[PDB]
Assembly symmetry: C4
């Protein structure tokens, strides 16, 4: 495991955050 | 677990996507 | 597992670092 | 698990790749 599945869920959530950051950076670069 | 497997796959796959976004940004800045 | 635990921690931690690098880049482009 | 530890190793390796990409992007941005 439950503890491994829970860390995976947290890692995935960081990934969504990073994807959002990249959306913004792209727009700041006019891409 | 199957869920753990799905999540590893999903994490790996989102990481491919992020790696490619970054590669496109690097390509665009290179030009 | 202990190794699996170490690796989840290491992945999570590198993800914090990457998220912050991206945040600094976004901050720098904002200015 | 062995198969989970092996996917974690692969995920970590993508992370190192992304860190390299970010090194280059930073230099392209003069940061």
């Amino acid at each position: 495991m439950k503890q491994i599945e829970d860390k995976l869920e947290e890692i995935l959530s960081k990934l969504y955050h990073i994807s959002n950051e990249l959306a913004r950076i792209k727009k700041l670069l006019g891409e």
